[PDB]
Amino acid sequence: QSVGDSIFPSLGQRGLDVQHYDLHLTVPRPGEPHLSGDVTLTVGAREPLSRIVLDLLGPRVSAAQWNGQRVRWVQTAQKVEVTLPRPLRPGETGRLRLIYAGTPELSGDPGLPIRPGWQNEAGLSYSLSEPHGTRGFLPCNDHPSDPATFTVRVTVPASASAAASGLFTTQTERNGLKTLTFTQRVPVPTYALGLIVGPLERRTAPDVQLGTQTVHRRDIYAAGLPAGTTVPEGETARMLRVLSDWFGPYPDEVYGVALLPVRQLALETAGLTTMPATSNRERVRLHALAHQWFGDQVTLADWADTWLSEGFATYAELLWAESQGEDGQAMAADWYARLSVLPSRPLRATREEEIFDASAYFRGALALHALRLKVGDAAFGQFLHSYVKTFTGRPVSTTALLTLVKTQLGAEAEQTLRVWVEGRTLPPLPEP
Ligand SMILES: N[C@@H](Cc1c[nH]c2ccccc12)C(=O)O
Ligand SMILES: [Zn+2]
């Protein structure tokens, strides 16, 4: 019934394909966890579904409709189960509307320093929900194998403002409440939905032209940022140019960061990375932008494969550094030095504690480094382009990566990657 994730075996619904979330979120007091929601999901199915089973953790559903009609539904501790009048069958779509309100719950953190979900701090409420926190404030198929598009209408006090992933279109004001509308038009995982409410400023920059593609530029600055918390002019443009030349077209219509005066890790929310000021460094800004491809466009089939996101986004930092004239092998050697004094593992994680560990970042990055040195920069660059296209609209797995390497780069290239993917001991440092 669930997706059957190796790490989180209860999340999601098997065969469920949510294509679009139309969310109206109302935050009465930014900084306080209470909220209310009105969401319509446009859902498809990959296998016949007699029910729609969504993840929800905290708020209480008060009403549900299926294609405009009253429908039978029950809410458990962590699920909303909607009995459909008839099975939803592949090729068909329906619209599930849920009315809900209450207090989002944070998913317990046994792996990361973040308890993921709806965060409340310093007059700010915002999503920091990787891996399974989005269900706290949004009834969702909470699994990266099912990305979707989002249209979000956020209602906040007039004194406040809001920013969500996607292009900002309208703001209206009535009875002391503002409503802002954002349109995420390319599909991303549930946790990649950025959503921040409170005292925030929108700042635009000139468009970035990437040969037959225009990328809009805007950052968000919340109040109370430390002195010197900035995105310096033109850096995002040069990063977009270097990364897209390596990976292919930037998958979204806008990019920027939302700089927050809190102390947490950066999260790669789509087209608008949620960036605590503590993490606002050049390498982290590159890292988060690389995730727009690897993580947000290319999504995981299973949470055990986080290195396909974290390792790829980490290696992009080395590709960027070399683009700025730096010595990439030295950076690779530094990564290796840091891993050499830590326990190592195969890249496919077996436990939740591992999915964001040092192996996922740096052993994954060095896995790509081994492959690149084996096949050369030209072949490696064409593989990255082929990889992104192969796994757009189809979730990626470690096995599928190795199969792709075998057909595209050959059996020797595949076994080079396999030494780094499999095997408990950390292999020697990859060298030219
Ligand atoms: N994906 C994040 C790590 C991360 C996992 N879960 C999170 C929750 C909140 C913020 C960050 C995270 C990164 O790029 O390093
Ligand atoms: Zn990352």
Task: Provide keyphrases for this structure.
alpha+beta, monomeric, hydrolase, binds zinc ion, Zinc metalloprotease, binds tryptophan, Metalloprotease
Give an overview in words.
The chain is an alpha+beta fold and 432 residues long. It has 2 domains: 200 residues, no CATH class; 232 residues, no CATH class. The chain is built from 7 helices and 20 strands. It has an 8-stranded mixed β-sheet, with no helix packed on it. Strands 16, 17, 18, 19 and 20 form a 5-stranded mixed β-sheet that branches. Strand 9 and strand 10 form a beta hairpin. The radius of gyration is 21 Å and the shape is globular. Bound molecules: tryptophan and zinc ion. Zinc ion binds next to helix 2 and helix 3. Zinc ion (ZN) binds next to helix 2 and helix 3. It is found in: Cytoplasm. Its EC number is 3.4.11.2. Pfam families: Peptidase_M1, Peptidase_M1_N.
